[PDB]
Write a protein that binds this ligand. Structure first.
Ligand SMILES: Nc1ncnc2c1ncn2[C@@H]1O[C@H](COP(=O)(O)OP(=O)(O)OP(=O)(O)O)[C@@H](O)[C@H]1O
Ligand SMILES: Nc1ncnc2c1ncn2[C@@H]1O[C@H](COP(=O)(O)OP(=O)(O)OP(=O)(O)O)[C@@H](O)[C@H]1O
Ligand SMILES: Nc1ncnc2c1ncn2[C@@H]1O[C@H](COP(=O)(O)OP(=O)(O)OP(=O)(O)O)[C@@H](O)[C@H]1O
Ligand SMILES: Nc1ncnc2c1ncn2[C@@H]1O[C@H](COP(=O)(O)OP(=O)(O)OP(=O)(O)O)[C@@H](O)[C@H]1O
Ligand SMILES: Nc1ncnc2c1ncn2[C@@H]1O[C@H](COP(=O)(O)OP(=O)(O)O)[C@@H](O)[C@H]1O
Ligand SMILES: Nc1ncnc2c1ncn2[C@@H]1O[C@H](COP(=O)(O)OP(=O)(O)O)[C@@H](O)[C@H]1O
Lengths: 262, 254, 276, 264, 273, 271, 15, 234
C-alpha cells in the first residue's frame, strides 16, 4: 500500500505519550532545513515499541498529516527463496524511492523478530542478514545524508532485536505503546462490531474496568466468539453477559462446578 | 503427486458412531456446515466468519473418528497432509506440494482440508520453518468469505509458533477430553452392538469404572472379555467376564 | 598427507627464542633435555640400557609462571619435526571433529618420523570420572580415553612421546599418567628463590640497558612476594619512562616507583567485604 | 563478512574531538606512538613492545568513540565486536570463531581489533567455558608472534575476573577514566556548540553548576534537546535559558535505573 | 574401510613376557581355545560355546599388554577398532558400520575382535538429554543376540574391556550374552618379583643383586611401576656415563615414586571419629 | 530394505521345548495363532482381534526366546528390521522407506513382524530444539499416522520390544492398536522348575540327581544365567578331567556367579 | 549434476 | 501430608508398602484357643537369641502383640499402650477389654498423621487375647490409617499374597480349628511357605484363658514340623 494518506483518526489511546512525538517528527519534516541552517545532525527516525492491540499504524497514518507524504509496503519481506537478500536488494531501490519524494512516510514492521535479539540462534552465514542490516545502515547512511526519509519500526518491546540502535546518529530515541484506558477500547469494539448487526443497551463501562491484561490483540478477537453463541442460541441483539462474561471468563476459566458456594 | 488421490472408496463412520460428549461437535459442525450451507444465517447477523477449527486432543480419542465422520457425511472431496509426502529432502521441492494443492484448492469446491499432524512440520541447519512460511503466504489471501475451512488436529499445541496462528487462521478452536461415565456409557453402547451377551444387565456401573481414560480402551476391553470368553469357551458373554480382564488392564498399567 | 587441521610448524616460519633467554631453571631444564635432546642421537645407548626410551612428560605448576617460556627454545634446536595446537580445539561445536582428526593427528606424526607435538592447556579436559549425566560433557571423556589408546594402545616405539602443560596438576583424570604412559612428571616452584631471583632479575638487563649512577639490584633484597612472571614484566613496564620524557636510558629512581607503580593492591575491601 | 566489524576506518578524523581527562589521553597515545613513528627507541634499548592493553571507564563516555578515532590516526581497520554478541550455545562455536578472528586479523596488518563488554568473560556447564577464557588469553602470548595488531577490552563491569588481571604482565596499561568535573564538563560543550549558532557570553556557568553525574552522550542529547524548541524563539542565536526547560527531565531518566560505577 | 581390520603386521609380544599372571590363561583360553580347537569335542556335549567374556581391573595391569600378545599364538584373526573411532558426527554412520562389522567376521569364523574402553557407551538414560551413541549399543547387541548372531556365536567368541566397571548399562548383560568375567587385580609382592627380571636384562656381569629386594617393599597397584622405576634407573647410569648399574642406584629411583607413594595428601577433619 | 526383511530362517529354537509359562503364551496364540485356526469364532460374536502386542523388558529374562521359537512355528512370513539401520543422512529416506513395508505387508495376509529394540526411535517427545535430532521425531509421526490413517488392518500385524518403557514410549502406543501391554520377568520359582526341566535332556548327573537342593532360596537373579550354571560344571569337570556329569562342582556357579552381583541387604532394619 | 544434499548433525549443549 | 486429586494421600499410599517388605507373621481364632507365629533370621551367626527384642511382645497379664515392618516405631507403642493398660486397671478398677486399647491405638496412628512435621509409622500390628471373665476369642488387626478390623487370620509381610489366600483353601468357618496340635499345624502350615529353612528362623506363642501364655522351643517346633516334613512326602 502506497498513498498520501487521509486524516488521522481520533487520537484516543496513549495520546498523552503521543502529542510529544509529532513534536519530534514533523520538525524533522518541517524546517529541518532551518535545523540544517542551525546546523544539527538531526535524526532520520526513532522507535515506538509496545505490545500490539494499539493502533500503531494509525500513528503512521498520522505521520503524513502535518506534511503530506506516502506510506510503506513491506512485511517480513526479506525471508526469500533465494540466496540473495532480494528484499535487501529491493530495500536499495525502495529506500531510493524513499529518497524519491522527500515528503515520505517510512515504517517497516517487526524490526524485532525480523532482526533477532543477538542472532546467536542462526549459523554464521545468515543469508546476508547483518548484510541486510548493513543495507539498513548503509541505507540509513544515505538516509542520514538528507531529511527526505523518516523511519520507525515496531515489535516486541525492547532487548528482543539487535542492540545497534544505541548510536544517536543511527536511531537515537525510543517510545513505547503502553496499555491505554478502555473507553476507546469500548468504542473500537463498536468498530469491530460496526461490520456486524447488534445493539448497545449495556453498561459496559464497569465492565471495561473489570478486565485488564487482555490486549487489543485479545480484544480484536473477542467480538465474534460470542456473536456465534447468541446465534447458536438464535438471538440477534447484542447483550452484556453473553459477551462480557461470555468472553472474558471463557478465556482461561470455565466449567463452573462449585458446590460450597451459595 | 504421491498423495494425488482425493478420498478412499468407502468411509464407514457416522456422527452417531461416537459418544464424544455431544458438545465439541456442535461448533465444529456449526463452522463447517452453517457458513457452507446457510450463509443467510451468517448475513442474518452480518458476520465475519472463521476459516479454521484449531484443535488439540490427546490421541486415542474419537476426534479422528470425528474427523473421518465429516468425510462420510458431506460426501465432498478430501485430503491428507502429512510429512511423508509433504516433507522431502529436496529443499524447495517440498513446497511444490502446497502450491499445487492450494492453487488447485481455490479452483475446486468443498475441497476442505484435514491436514492433520502438522505438529510434525510446524515445529519451530533445519529448513522446516520455510515450509511453514510457505503455508501462511497461501492463507492470508483467501482466508475469509468462502465455503472452505482449515480444520485439522495435533498432539502438542504448545509446539509451534503462533506467528502463523493469528485469529484469521483458526479462530474457533477445538479442545477434546475424556468423557463422563454417561459419555463413557453411550460410547459403550456402540461396540456392544455386535456380539452375543447376557442381554439385559447393568452395564452402566462399569462406566463408573471409567476414571481418566480413553474410549479406545473400552472398545478394546470388550474384546478381551470375548477372548476371556474364548478361553472360557463362553459362547455368550456374561457380566463377570468383562470384569475379569478390565480389572487387569489398568492394574497392569498401574 | 595434507590433513588440514595442523601443519608442519617451523619449517621456515618459527619463533626465534633461545635457551639462554631463560635465567636459571636448570633444576628442571637439565632433566628434560636429559630425555629429549639426547634420544635424537644416542639411541644406541638406550638400546644398550633401558628396554624403552624414558619419554612422556607432564610439565605443571601454576600458570603464567614459566612453563611455556621453556617449551619452544627447544623448538629452535630440534633438527626435527614440531607441532603446536590450541589446547581446546578438540571442543568442536558439533561432534566427531576430534575423533576424525586425532586419529589423523598421529597420522601426521607417524609419517613425520620422528617429530614432537605440544598443547596449550588441558584444564578443561582433566576429568577423572562422572556418572553419565548428559552428553553435554560425555564428549569430553571419550576424547580423553581415545587419546590414551592413541598414545600407547598398540603403536609402541616409532611414535613420539609427548608433553602435558596445564594450570593445575591435581584434577588430572588419573589412569592417564602412568609409569608406562608417561614415565616422567616435573614442575617448578613459586616460593622465594634467593639463588634464582638474584640472577633472573637482571639476566634480561643484558637484553636491556642501564647506566648505573648507583646500584639497582636492591629490590631483590626486599623479599616479600618473589614471583616468576612479574619479575621480567616490571622492567617490561619500567623502561617506558625515560622514553616518556626523552631520557635515553633509565635511572634507579625511575624504577622504584615503577615497582610500586604496579600497585600490589594489598588493601582492597573486596577482601574485607566477604567474610566479615 | 567481518567487514561488518572492520570497516569504520578510512575517513580520517581528528584525535581532537574529545578533551576528557587529558593525562590519560596523554597516556595511550604516547605509548602507542612507538611502533609507528619512533620504533628506533625499542631497538636502542632492546625491550619488547606493549603486548596489547585494556582500560576501564563506566558506560557511555566515548570509549568506543575513543577507540574508533585512533585507527583513523594511522590507518588501521577499527573493528566492532561485542563480547556478548559472540555468544552461542554451541560449545566450539565460541572458541572456533575467535580463532578465525585472529586469522583474518593477521591476514591484514598493521591493523587493530577491539572488544568492550567482556566482563562476563565445579558446575557441569561452566567447566568448559573457562577454557575459552583459558584459550584466548593463551592466544595472546602463548606460542605465536604478533606484529602490528592489537586489542582493547573496554568494559563497564570491572569485577571481571581475577586471573586475566591477576598477572598484569600479560596485559598492561590497565587504565581507568572517571567521569567529568566542571573541569571536564565545560570544555565538552565547545565541540558540541561548534557547528551551531549561539549568542556569545559565558553562559556555561550552569554547566559546572549542575550535571554532576551526567556523561557525554546525554549532554550532547541535551544540546539538540534545546535546539528543538529553541526554534519557537526562532532567533538567529540561542539562549542558555532555552536548554533549561529540559535539563530537568533528562536527569529524571538519568534518575531511572540508578547504577553504580567503581573503578578497578 | 579396512583400516580397523587385522594385520599382516602382527605385533611382537608374547604371553610369557607377562610374569605374575599365571592362572588367568588357564581360566580364559579355553573358551577362546578349546571348543574352537575341537568343536566335535565340545559338541560331544555341546552345551553352549558361549559368547564373549569381559575383564575388569584397574590400570597398572597391562590388560592391553596382555591383549597384544594374545594376537600372537592365535590360529585366528584379531581386529581392532582403535576404541570409539566408529562414531562420527552424524547418525547414519553408526549402524551401517556395525552392520559392516559383524559380516566382516562372519566370513572368518576363526577370528575375533577387541575393545579396550566401554566407558563411552555406558548407562543410557534419556529425557531429551542423551545421544545417538545409545542407538548403536542396541543394534550391536541386537545383532549379537538375534536371528543372525548365534551363527556368529557358532563362529565367534569376542571380548570387551574397560577400567571402570559399574558405570555402564546392566541391560547390556544377559549373562549368557556374556558368560564369564574375571578380575585382573594388582599383583602380589612375589608376583612382582619375576617382573623386573623381564625388563632390566641389562646388568653386565654384576653382582650383589637382590631382585626380591624391591617387591620386598612395594605397596602399589601397577606392575608397570616395575618398569617406570626400572626405566629411569638406567637414566642415572645414562647421565653419569657409566653403563653399569647396581641395587642402590636402582633403589632410589623409587624416589620418583616417593611422590606417587606419597602424593596423596590427607585431610585433618575429625568431624567424626 | 527388502534384503534384511525376509528372514525366513527360523532356528532350532523349539517352541514348547521352552518351559517358561502358559497364560502369556496362549494370550499370543489367542492373539495370533487361534485367529489363524478358526477365526469364524471371532465372526460368531463379531470380533476384531488385536493389532499386535508389546512385551516389556526385564533384560536377560526371556524377551525373545519364544519369538524365534514362534518363527520356528510361524507357519507364515516373518520380518525383522532395525531402526538404527533404517535411518540415514538425508531427510525422509527411512521415512520414505518405512512406508514401503506396509505394502510389503500388503504382500500377504500372513503378514507379521518382529521389531528390534526401538529405544532410539520414538523414545520421548522432547522439543528437540537443539538441532538435527528432530529427524527421529520427524520419523515416528511418519509411522503412527501411516499406521492408522485409514486401514482395514489387512492383517497388518506387529510385535514390538524394548528393555525399559517408562524411560521412553510416552504416547506412541495406544489401546486397540496395542491393547496388550504385557510382561516378562522372573518367576520366583519356575526358573527352578522348567529350566532344568529342559536341561535334564542332555546331561547325566553321573552320581546322583542332587536337584532337590540345586534350587532357589527366593534368590533374586535371572534364570537366563542357568545356561551358565549348566556350563561351568562341565568346565570344572575338565578343570579336573571329569568326563562324566557331577553335581558337586556344580555348586560353585551360583556361589561364584550369583555371588558377584551383590545387593545391599539392609534388612537388619525391617525386623 | 547435484547440489541437493543435506545431512543432519549431532550436538550436545549445556542445559 | 495432604490430599491428591485422586482421593489418595501421597505419604500413605506409600507407608503401608513398607510393612510389605519386612517379616511375616500371623495368628488365628481357634475353637477355644488363640495363637500367633512369626519370623526370625536363621544364619544370623555369632549371636544369642535369648535377649533380642522378640517380634512378640506382651502388654498385660492376658494380652500380647506382634508387630511387623519397622522395629523402632514398634517399641514406642508398647510403652504408651502399657501405660493405658496399667492405668485402666486403676481408675475403673476393672482390667481392660481387648477393643479398648485397640480403639485407643487405632486413634494414635492418626494423631501422628494430621499435624505439622510428623511422619506416620512404618508399622502394622495385630493383637490377641481373651477378655477378662469371658471365653470368646478376640483378635484385631491394625495399620497406620487407624482402621481397626477383626480378621480371623491376618498376615503382613513378604511373599504374603498367596499366604493371604492360602488359608482360604485351608480354613473353614463351620469347621474351625479343633485343637492346638492342628491349630498350630495351621499356624505353621501357612508360614512355612516363606520360611524356606528350618525351625530356627521363626518364633511363636499362644494364649489360653486366665493368662495361660506359653512360648515354644526350637525343639518343640522340630517335633511337629517333622510330622508334616514326613507328611509332605506322600
Ligand atoms: N470419544 C470417542 N468416540 C468414538 N470413538 C472413540 C472415542 N474415544 C476413543 N475412541 C476409539 O478409540 C480408537 C482409537 O482412537 P483414535 O484412532 O481416534 O486415536 P487418534 O485420536 O486417531 O490418535 P491420533 O491423534 O494419533 O491420530 C478409535 O477406534 C476410536 O473410535
Ligand atoms: N625466565 C624467564 N625468561 C623469560 N620470560 C619469563 C621467564 N619467566 C617468566 N617469563 C615470562 O612470564 C610470562 C608468563 O609465564 P608463562 O606463560 O611461562 O607461564 P605458563 O605456566 O607458561 O602459563 P601458561 O601455561 O598458561 O602459558 C611469559 O610470557 C614469559 O615471557
Ligand atoms: N605383568 C605384566 N607384564 C607385562 N606388562 C605389564 C605387566 N604389568 C604391567 N604392565 C605394563 O602396564 C602397561 C599398561 O597397563 P595399564 O593397565 O596401566 O594400562 P592399559 O591396560 O594399557 O590401559 P587400558 O586397559 O585402559 O587401555 C604396559 O606398558 C605394560 O608394560
Ligand atoms: N525360560 C528360559 N529358558 C531358557 N533360557 C532362557 C529363559 N529365559 C531367559 N533365557 C536366556 O536368556 C537369554 C536371552 O534372553 P532374552 O530373550 O531376554 O534376551 P535376548 O533376546 O537375547 O536379548 P536382545 O533381545 O536384547 O538381543 C538366552 O540365552 C536364554 O537362554
Ligand atoms: N482508532 C482505531 N482505529 C482502528 N484500529 C485501532 C484504533 N485504535 C486501536 N486500534 C487497534 O490497534 C491494533 C494495531 O496494533 P499494532 O501494534 O499496529 O499491531 P501490529 O503489531 O500487528 O502491527 C489493531 O488491532 C487495531 O484494532
Ligand atoms: N570525554 C568526552 N568528551 C566529549 N564528549 C563525550 C565524551 N565522552 C562521551 N562523549 C559523548 O558521548 C557519546 C558516547 O557514545 P559512545 O562512544 O557510543 O558510548 P561509549 O562512551 O560507551 O563508547 C558520544 O556521542 C560523545 O560525543
Amino acid at each position: 500500500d502506497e498513498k498520501p494518506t487521509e486524516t488521522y483518526s481520533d487520537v484516543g489511546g496513549l495520546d498523552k505519550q503521543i502529542e510529544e512525538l509529532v513534536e519530534a517528527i514533523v520538525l524533522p519534516m518541517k524546517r529541518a532545513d532551518k535545523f540544517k541552517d542551525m546546523g544539527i545532525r538531526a535524526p532520520k527516525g526513532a522507535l515506538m515499541y509496545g505490545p500490539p492491540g494499539t493502533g500503531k499504524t494509525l500513528l503512521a497514518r498520522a505521520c503524513a498529516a502535518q506534511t503530506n507524504a506516502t506510506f510503506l509496503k513491506l512485511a517480513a519481506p526479506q525471508l526469500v527463496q533465494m540466496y540473495i537478500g532480494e528484499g535487501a536488494k529491493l530495500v536499495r531501490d525502495a529506500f531510493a524511492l524513499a529518497k524519491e519524494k522527500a515528503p515520505t512516510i517510512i515504517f517497516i514492521d517487526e524490526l524485532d523478530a525480523i532482526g533477532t535479539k543477538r542472532f546467536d540462534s542462526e549459523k554464521s552465514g545468515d543469508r546476508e542478514v547483518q548484510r541486510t542490516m548493513l543495507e539498513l545502515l548503509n541505507q540509513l547512511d544515505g538516509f542520514s545524508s538528507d531529511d527526505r526519509v523518516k523511519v520507525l519500526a515496531a515489535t516486541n518491546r525492547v532487548d528482543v532485536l539487535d542492540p545497534a540502535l544505541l548510536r544517536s546518529g543511527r536511531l537515537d530515541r525510543k517510545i513505547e505503546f503502553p496499555l491505554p484506558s478502555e473507553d476507546s477500547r469500548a468504542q473500537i469494539l463498536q468498530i469491530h462490531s460496526r461490520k456486524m448487526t447488534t445493539d448497545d443497551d449495556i453498561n459496559w463501562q464497569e465492565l471495561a474496568r473489570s478486565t485488564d491484561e487482555f490486549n487489543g490483540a485479545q480484544l480484536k478477537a473477542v467480538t465474534v466468539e460470542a456473536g456465534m453463541i447468541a446465534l447458536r442460541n438464535g438471538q440477534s441483539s447484542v447483550k452484556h453477559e453473553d459477551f462480557v462474561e461470555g468472553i472474558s471468563e471463557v478465556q482461561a476459566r470455565k466449567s463452573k462446578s462449585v458446590s460450597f458456594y451459595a | 503427486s504421491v498423495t494425488m488421490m482425493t478420498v478412499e472408496e468407502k468411509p464407514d463412520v457416522t456422527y452417531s458412531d461416537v459418544g464424544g460428549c455431544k458438545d465439541q461437535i456442535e461448533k465444529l459442525r456449526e463452522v463447517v456446515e452453517l457458513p457452507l450451507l446457510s450463509p443467510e444465517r451468517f448475513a442474518t447477523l452480518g458476520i465475519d466468519p472463521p476459516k479454521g477449527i484449531l484443535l488439540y486432543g490427546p490421541p486415542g480419542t474419537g476426534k479422528t473418528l470425528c474427523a473421518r465422520a465429516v468425510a462420510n457425511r458431506t460426501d465432498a472431496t478430501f485430503i491428507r497432509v502429512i510429512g511423508s509426502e509433504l516433507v522431502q529432502k529436496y529443499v524447495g521441492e517440498g513446497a511444490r506440494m502446497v502450491r499445487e494443492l492450494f492453487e488447485m484448492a481455490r479452483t475446486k469446491k468443498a475441497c476442505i482440508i484435514f491436514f492433520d499432524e502438522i505438529d510434525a512440520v510446524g515445529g519451530a541447519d533445519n529448513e522446516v520453518q520455510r515450509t511453514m512460511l510457505e503455508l501462511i503466504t497461501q492463507l492470508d489471501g483467501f482466508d475469509p468469505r468462502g465455503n472452505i475451512k482449515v480444520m485439522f488436529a495435533t498432539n502438542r499445541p504448545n509446539t509451534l509458533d503462533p506467528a502463523l496462528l493469528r485469529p484469521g487462521r483458526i479462530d474457533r478452536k477445538v479442545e477434546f477430553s475424556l468423557p463422563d461415565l454417561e459419555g463413557r456409557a453411550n460410547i459403550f453402547r456402540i461396540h456392544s452392538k455386535s456380539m452375543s451377551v447376557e442381554r439385559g444387565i447393568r452395564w452402566e456401573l462399569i462406566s463408573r469404572l471409567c476414571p481418566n481414560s480413553t474410549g479406545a480402551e473400552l472398545r478394546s476391553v470388550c474384546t478381551e472379555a470375548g477372548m476371556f470368553a474364548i478361553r472360557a469357551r463362553r459362547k455368550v458373554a456374561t457380566e463377570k467376564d468383562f470384569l475379569k480382564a478390565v480389572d487387569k488392564v489398568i492394574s497392569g498399567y498401574k | 598427507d595434507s590433513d588440514s587441521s595442523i601443519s608442519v610448524m617451523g619449517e621456515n616460519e618459527k619463533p626465534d627464542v633461545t635457551y639462554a633467554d631463560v635465567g636459571g631453571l636448570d633444576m628442571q631444564k637439565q632433566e628434560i633435555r636429559e630425555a629429549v635432546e639426547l634420544p635424537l642421537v644416542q639411541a644406541d645407548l638406550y638400546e644398550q640400557i633401558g628396554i624403552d626410551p624414558p619419554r612422556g612428560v607432564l610439565l605443571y605448576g601454576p600458570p603464567g609462571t614459566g612453563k611455556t617460556m621453556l617449551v619452544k627454545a627447544v623448538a629452535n634446536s630440534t633438527k626435527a619435526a614440531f607441532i603446536r595446537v590450541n589446547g581446546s580445539e578438540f571442543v568442536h561445536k558439533y561432534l566427531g571433529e576430534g575423533p576424525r582428526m586425532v586419529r589423523d593427528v598421529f597420522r601426521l606424526a607417524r609419517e613425520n618420523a620422528p617429530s614432537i607435538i605440544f598443547i596449550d592447556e588441558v584444564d578443561s579436559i582433566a576429568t577423572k570420572r562422572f556418572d553419565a549425566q548428559t552428553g553435554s560433557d560425555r564428549e569430553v571423556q571419550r576424547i580423553l580415553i581415545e587419546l590414551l589408546t592413541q598414545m600407547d594402545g598398540f603403536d609402541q616405539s616409532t611414535n613420539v612421546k609427548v608433553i602435558m602443560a596445564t594450570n593445575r596438576a591435581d584434577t588430572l583424570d588419573p589412569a592417564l599418567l602412568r609409569p608406562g604412559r608417561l614415565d616422567r612428571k616435573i614442575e617448578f616452584p613459586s616460593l622465594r628463590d634467593r639463588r634464582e631471583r638474584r640472577l633472573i632479575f637482571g639476566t634480561i638487563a643484558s637484553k636491556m640497558s642501564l647506566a648505573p649512577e648507583a646500584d639497582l639490584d636492591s629490590l631483590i633484597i626486599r623479599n616479600d612476594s618473589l614471583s616468576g612472571a612479574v619479575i621480567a614484566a616490571i622492567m617490561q613496564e619500567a623502561g617506558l619512562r625515560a622514553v616518556r620524557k626523552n631520557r635515553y636510558v633509565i635511572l634507579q629512581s625511575d624504577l622504584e616507583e615503577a615497582y610500586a607503580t604496579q600497585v600490589k593492591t594489598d588493601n582492597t575491601v573486596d577482601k574485607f567485604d566477604f567474610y566479615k | 563478512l567481518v567487514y561488518n566489524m572492520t570497516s569504520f576506518e578510512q575517513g580520517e578524523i581528528t584525535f581532537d574531538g574529545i578533551g576528557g581527562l587529558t593525562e590519560q589521553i596523554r597516556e595511550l597515545r604516547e605509548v602507542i606512538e612507538l611502533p609507528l613513528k619512533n620504533p628506533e627507541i625499542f631497538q636502542r634499548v632492546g625491550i619488547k613492545p606493549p603486548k596489547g592493553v585494556l582500560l576501564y571507564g563506566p558506560p557511555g563516555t566515548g570509549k568506543t568513540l575513543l577507540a574508533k578515532a585512533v585507527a583513523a590516526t594511522i590507518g588501521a581497520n577499527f573493528i566492532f565486536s561485542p563480547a556478548s554478541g559472540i555468544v552461542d550455545k554451541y560449545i566450539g562455536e565460541s572458541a572456533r570463531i575467535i580463532r578465525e578472528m585472529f586469522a583474518y586479523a593477521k591476514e591484514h596488518e598493521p591493523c587493530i581489533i577491539f572488544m568492550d563488554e567482556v566482563d562476563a568473560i565445579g558446575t557441569s556447564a561452566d567447566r568448559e567455558i573457562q577454557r575459552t577464557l583459558m584459550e584466548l588469553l593463551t592466544q595472546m602470548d602463548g606460542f605465536d608472534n604478533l606484529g602490528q595488531t592489537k586489542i582493547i577490552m573496554a568494559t563497564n563491569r570491572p569485577d571481571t575476573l581475577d586471573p586475566a588481571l591477576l598477572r598484569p604482565g600479560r596485559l598492561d596499561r590497565k587504565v581507568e577514566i572517571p567521569l567529568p568535573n566542571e573541569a571536564g564538563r565545560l570544555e565538552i560543550f565547545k565541540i558540541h556548540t561548534a557547528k551551531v549558532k549561539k549568542t556569545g557570553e559565558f553562559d556555561f556557568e550552569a554547566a559546572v553548576k549542575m550535571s554532576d553525574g551526567f556523561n557525554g552522550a546525554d549532554i550532547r542529547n541535551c544540546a539538540t534537546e534545546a535546539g528543538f524548541f529553541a526554534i519557537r524563539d526562532d532567533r538567529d542565536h540561542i539562549n542558555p535559558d532555552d536548554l533549561m526547560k529540559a535539563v530537568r527531565k533528562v536527569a529524571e531518566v538519568k534518575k531511572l535505573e540508578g547504577t553504580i560505577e567503581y573503578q578497578k | 574401510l579396512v583400516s580397523l581390520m587385522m594385520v599382516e603386521k602382527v605385533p611382537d609380544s608374547t604371553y610369557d613376557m607377562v610374569g605374575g599372571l599365571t592362572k588367568q590363561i588357564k581360566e580364559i583360553k579355553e573358551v577362546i581355545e578349546l571348543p574352537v580347537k575341537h568343536p566335535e569335542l565340545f559338541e560331544s556335549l555341546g552345551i553352549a560355546q558361549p559368547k564373549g567374556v569381559i575383564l575388569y581391573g584397574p590400570p597398572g595391569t597391562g590388560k592391553t599388554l596382555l591383549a597384544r600378545a594374545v594376537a600372537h599364538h592365535t590360529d585366528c584373526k584379531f581386529i581392532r577398532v582403535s576404541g570409539a573411532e566408529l562414531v562420527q558426527k552424524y547418525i547414519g554412520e553408526g549402524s551401517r558400520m556395525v552392520r559392516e562389522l559383524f559380516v566382516m567376521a562372519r566370513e572368518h569364523a576363526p577370528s575375533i575382535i577387541f575393545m579396550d574402553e566401554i566407558d563411552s557407551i555406558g548407562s543410557t538414560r534419556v529425557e531429551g538429554s542423551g545421544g545417538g551413541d545409545s542407538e548403536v549399543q542396541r543394534t550391536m547387541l541386537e545383532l549379537l543376540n538375534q536371528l543372525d548372531g548365534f551363527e556368529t556365536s557358532k563362529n565367534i567368541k569376542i571380548i570387551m574391556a574397560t577400567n571402570r566397571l559399574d558405570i555402564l548399562d546392566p541391560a547390556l548383560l544377559r549373562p549368557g550374552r556374556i558368560d564369564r568375567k574375571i578380575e585382573f587385580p594388582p599383583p602380589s609382592v612375589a608376583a612382582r618379583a619375576e617382573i623386573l627380571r623381564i625388563h632390566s636384562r641389562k646388568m653386565n656381569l654384576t653382582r650383589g643383586i637382590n631382585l626380591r629386594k624391591v617387591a620386598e617393599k612395594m605397596n602399589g597397584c601397577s606392575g608397570a611401576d616395575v618398569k617406570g622405576v626400572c626405566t629411569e634407573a638406567g637414566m642415572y647410569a645414562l647421565r653419569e656415563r657409566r653403563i653399569h648399574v647396581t641395587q642402590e642406584d636402582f633403589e632410589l629411583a623409587v624416589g620418583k615414586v616417593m611422590n606417587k607413594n606419597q602424593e596423596t595428601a590427607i585431610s585433618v577433619a575429625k568431624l567424626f571419629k | 530394505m527388502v534384503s534384511v526383511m525376509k528372514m525366513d530362517k527360523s532356528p532350532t529354537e523349539s517352541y514348547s521345548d521352552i518351559g517358561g509359562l502358559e497364560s502369556q503364551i496362549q494370550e499370543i496364540k489367542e492373539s495370533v495363532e487361534l485367529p489363524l485356526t478358526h477365526p469364524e469364532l471371532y465372526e460368531e460374536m463379531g470380533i476384531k482381534p488385536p493389532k499386535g502386542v508389546i512385551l516389556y523388558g526385564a533384560p536377560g529374562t526371556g524377551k525373545t526366546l519364544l519369538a524365534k521359537a514362534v518363527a520356528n512355528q510361524t507357519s507364515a512370513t516373518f520380518l525383522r528390521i532395525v531402526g538404527s539401520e533404517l535411518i540415514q543422512k538425508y531427510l525422509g529416506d527411512g521415512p520414505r522407506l518405512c512406508r514401503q513395508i506396509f505394502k510389503v505387508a500388503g504382500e500377504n495376509a500372513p503378514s507379521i513382524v518382529f521389531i528390534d529394540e526401538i529405544d532410539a526411535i520414538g523414545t520421548k517427545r522432547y522439543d528437540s530444539n537443539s538441532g538435527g535430532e528432530r529427524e527421529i521425531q520427524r520419523t515416528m509421526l511418519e509411522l503412527l499416522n501411516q499406521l492408522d490413517g485409514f486401514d482395514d488392518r489387512g492383517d497388518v500385524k506387529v510385535i514390538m520390544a524394548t528393555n525399559k518403557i517408562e524411560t521412553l514410549d510416552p504416547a506412541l502406543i495406544r489401546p486397540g492398536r496395542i491393547d496388550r501391554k504385557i510382561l516378562f520377568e522372573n518367576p520366583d520359582l519356575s526358573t527352578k522348575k522348567k529350566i532344568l526341566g529342559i536341561h535334564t535332556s542332555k546331561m547325566n548327573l553321573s552320581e546322583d540327581v542332587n536337584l532337590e537342593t540345586l534350587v532357589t532360596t527366593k534368590d533374586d537373579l535371572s534364570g537366563a544365567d542357568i545356561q551358565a550354571m549348566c556350563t561351568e560344571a562341565g568346565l570344572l569337570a575338565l578343570r579336573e578331567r571329569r568326563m562324566q556329569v557331577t553335581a558337586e562342582d556344580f555348586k560353585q556357579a551360583k556361589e561364584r556367579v550369583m555371588k558377584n552381583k551383590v545387593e545391599e541387604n539392609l534388612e537388619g532394619l525391617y525386623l | 549434476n547435484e547440489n541437493v544434499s543435506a545431512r543432519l548433525g549431532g550436538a550436545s549443549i549445556a542445559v | 501430608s495432604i490430599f491428591s486429586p485422586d482421593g489418595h494421600i501421597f505419604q500413605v499410599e506409600y507407608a503401608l508398602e513398607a510393612v510389605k517388605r519386612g517379616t511375616c507373621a500371623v495368628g488365628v481364632k481357634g475353637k477355644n484357643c488363640v495363637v500367633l507365629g512369626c519370623e526370625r533370621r536363621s544364619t544370623l551367626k555369632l549371636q544369642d537369641t535369648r535377649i533380642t527384642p522378640s517380634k512378640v511382645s506382651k502388654i498385660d497379664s492376658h494380652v500380647v502383640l506382634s508387630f511387623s515392618g519397622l522395629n523402632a516405631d514398634s517399641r514406642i507403642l508398647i510403652e504408651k499402650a502399657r501405660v493405658e493398660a496399667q492405668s485402666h486397671r486403676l481408675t475403673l478398677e476393672d482390667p481392660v477389654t481387648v477393643e479398648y486399647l485397640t480403639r485407643y491405638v487405632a486413634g494414635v496412628q492418626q494423631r501422628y498423621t494430621q499435624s505439622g512435621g510428623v511422619r506416620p509409622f512404618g508399622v502394622s500390628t495385630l493383637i490377641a487375647g481373651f477378655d477378662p471373665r469371658d471365653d470368646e476369642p478376640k483378635l484385631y488387626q491394625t495399620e497406620p490409617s487407624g482402621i481397626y478390623s477383626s480378621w480371623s487370620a491376618q498376615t503382613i509381610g513378604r511373599n504374603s499374597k498367596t499366604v493371604r489366600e492360602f488359608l482360604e483353601k485351608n480354613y473353614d468357618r463351620k469347621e474351625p480349628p479343633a485343637t492346638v496340635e492342628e491349630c498350630v499345624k495351621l499356624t505353621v502350615r501357612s508360614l512355612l511357605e516363606v520360611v524356606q529353612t528350618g525351625a530356627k528362623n521363626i518364633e511363636i506363642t499362644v494364649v489360653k484363658p486366665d493368662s495361660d501364655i506359653v512360648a515354644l522351643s526350637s525343639e518343640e517346633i522340630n517335633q511337629y514340623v517333622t510330622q508334616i516334613e514326613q507328611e509332605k512326602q506322600e
